[PDB]
Amino acid sequence: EGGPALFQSDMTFKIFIDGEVNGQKFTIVADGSSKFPHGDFNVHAVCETGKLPMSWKPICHLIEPFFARYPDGISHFAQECFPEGLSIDRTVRFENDGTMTSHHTYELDDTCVVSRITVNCDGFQPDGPIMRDQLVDILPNETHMFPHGPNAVRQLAFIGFTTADGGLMMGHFDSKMTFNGSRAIEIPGPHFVTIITKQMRDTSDKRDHVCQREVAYAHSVPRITSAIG
Amino acid sequence: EGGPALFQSDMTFKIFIDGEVNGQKFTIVADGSSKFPHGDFNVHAVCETGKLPMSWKPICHLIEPFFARYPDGISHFAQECFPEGLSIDRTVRFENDGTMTSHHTYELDDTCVVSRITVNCDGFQPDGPIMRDQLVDILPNETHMFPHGPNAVRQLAFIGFTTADGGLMMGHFDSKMTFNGSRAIEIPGPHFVTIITKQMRDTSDKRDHVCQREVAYAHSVPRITSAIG
């Protein structure tokens, strides 16, 4: 084969982000380590226009669904999209603040994964927690995956960020992964992917950047057999 | 504060819902039971105005967060809420359909929680799957519970329902649970409550009713410390 067959070796991956936020175009390149059976992987990403013009927090999701660990019995869409690869459209709407809108595309490089991304960030508060970099932590979460028509899936998530003064900035994440190819592909039934993420600027680098860790795995949930028995 | 002490016995509950949908009033009354350790309780619901004019499925979250089994280490906020009690303001925005707005008060009467709810459902598509009773089941979810101000927690969820043509009706659920008391109560950290829900008709009760079983348990997700391993 195959699709998930391709993913049984250890893996590297490459991320070319080409973003902007309220005007300031920037470029971010990152590259990647994920060891079979995946589920746990770290990213080094380097801001190539020197300094990043806003927080690195909201970048987390931008910097690899195929690397989530799936149990047998839940079909691994993101992995089955290969080799044809997949695209992603995604909005994240932060309350009383801005909206990221990414478009990602992905290509397999026999055992590498090239990821090429546009992201616009607009209507954002320049005085707010993302620009003033008042974003303390990134709450873990149970993202919801749903079958989206014949060749895609949808990922819905609430992304929690803790504010300087110990509040909460809530983001609404709506993301659609679509298979590029023409052949048939199984759309898994409704499930979840748990995503746990830790971020930080690798203190030994002259150029703005960060290291990032993510644990991410799929599960389903109980079924009820009857409403009395 | 001695609220969780109270819930250490087997309780009952009674619910009065005053509803309207597309300008047509309806009333639902419910009762049920939740034996310690709780988290798997059932409710018998009856429409007091004859025939309900919409699917029963979307009524599910209306007919008891204090009956979610928590584990130690997470404050079980809806339980700390007594003896005083708690209220909920909840909105469910359905994709391309209407909104359900509800206000709930909860009172404890010895070992009975009495619930009083007014809900308004507006802008619902008359030929839609909700008004045409074409919802077929309810998808299990992972609500996300966040602490909110000094007196409240916020609950956020994707509540989906399978329609009869096997598509998906998706609700954006946003709920604020407020402590009615003037003391200070412990505001738990960000966690989750998993909810599984199933409805069935008891064929002995000739009235318009549902029996609804719910499995609900809170859990939190371990927060990675090393950005390494």
Report DSSP letters for B114-155, one per residue: EEEEEEEEES--TTSTTTTT-EEEE--EEEEEEEETTTEEEE
Q: Is A147 on the interface with B (CB under 8 A)?
A: yes
* Residues of chain B positioned with their CB less than 8 A from the CB of A142: 142, 144, 192, 221
Continuous segment of H or E residues that includes residue B86? strand B86-94
Distances (CA, A) of A3 to A73, A81, A90, A153: 15, 7, 23, 16
Closest of B166, B171, B138, B174 to residue B60, by C-alpha: B138
CA distance B153 to A51: 37
Pairing status of strand A11-21 against strand A112-122:
parallel
Cα separation, B66 vs B85, in Å, equals 11
CA distances from A182 to A85, A86, A116 (A): 11, 12, 21
Instruction: Tell me the CB-side half-sphere exposure of residue A10, using CA atoms within 13 A.
Output: 4
CB neighbourhood size of A106 (10 A): 24
Phi, psi of B155 (to 5 degrees): -120, 130
Please give the sequence-ordered ranges of beta strands (E in DSSP) within A8-151, or none if there are none.
11-21, 26-34, 40-47, 86-94, 99-109, 112-122, 135-138, 141-147
B114: which 2 tokens?
Answer: 């009495």
CA–CA gap between residue A179 and residue B109 (Å, rounded): 55
* C-beta atoms surrounding A197 within 10 Å: 22
CB contact under 8 A, A224 and B156: no
Give the resolution value in Å. Answer: 2.2
Give the H or E element holding residue B79. helix B77-80
CA–CA separation, B196 and A224 (whole Å): 7
Burial of A94 (0-12, 13-18, 19+ CB in 10 A): buried
CA distance A26 to B225: 29
* Yes or no, beta carbons of B168 and A147 under 8 Å apart: yes
A204 touches chain B (CB under 8 A): no
How far apart are the C-alpha atoms of B114 and B105, rounded to whole Å?
A: 8
DSSP 8-state secondary structure symbol assigned to residue B71: P
Maximum Cα–Cα distance for chain B, whole Å?
Answer: 61
What gap in Å lies between CA A210 and CA A201, rounded to an integer?
4
Cis amide leading into A83 (omega within 30): yes
Q: In this structure, are residues B18 and B118 in contact, taking their beta carbons and an 8 Å threshold?
A: yes
* Three-point CA angle A135, A43, A207, nearest 5°: 70
Breaks (C-N over 2.5 A) in chain A follow: 63
Q: Which of B160, B215, B228 sits opposite A213 (nearest CB)?
A: B228
Residue type, A74: I
Q: Is the dihedral of CA B34, B39, B40, B45 positive or negative?
A: positive
Amino acid, res. A208: D
Residue that has been written with the tokens 């990221």 in this structure: A100
Asked if B213 and A227 come within 8 Å (Cβ–Cβ), the reply is yes
Determine the Cα–Cα distance for residues B79 and B184; give it in Å rounded to an integer.
14
Q: Output the CA–CA distances (angstroms, integers) from residue B120 to A99, A131, B14, B102, in the order listed.
A: 30, 39, 20, 6
- A-chain residues near B194 (CB < 8 A): 221-222
Q: Which of B197, B131, B123, B125 is nearest to B159 (CA)?
A: B197
Q: Residue A178 and residue A126: Cα distance in Å, rounded?
A: 33
Can you give the residue ranges of every domain in chain A?
Answer: 1-229
Place of tokens 């190539």: A48
Classify residue A167 by burial, with Cβ atoms within 10 Å: 0-12, 13-18, 19+: middle
Return the closest-CA partner of residue B139 out of A175, A154, A190. Answer: A190
CA terminus-to-terminus distance, chain A: 44
- Copy the structure tokens of residue A39: 């589920």
Q: Are B198 and A226 in contact (CB under 8 A)?
A: yes
How far apart CA A18 and CA A120 sit, in angstroms, is 9
Q: Which CATH superfamily is domain A1-229 in?
A: Green fluorescent protein (2.40.155.10)
CA distance A147 to B149: 36
DSSP 8-state secondary structure symbol assigned to residue A142: E
How far apart, in whole angstroms, are the C-alpha atoms of residue B70 and residue B218?
5
The CA-based dihedral angle spanning residues A160, A164, A167, A169, taken in that order and rounded to the nearest 10 degrees: -40
3-state helix, strand, coil in chain B (%, to 5): 5, 50, 40
Residues 6+ apart with CB under 8 A from B159: B60, B61, B92, B138, B139, B141, B170, B171, B173
Beta strands B209-219 and B191-200, pairing class: antiparallel
User: What tokens were used for A128?
Assistant: 């707010």
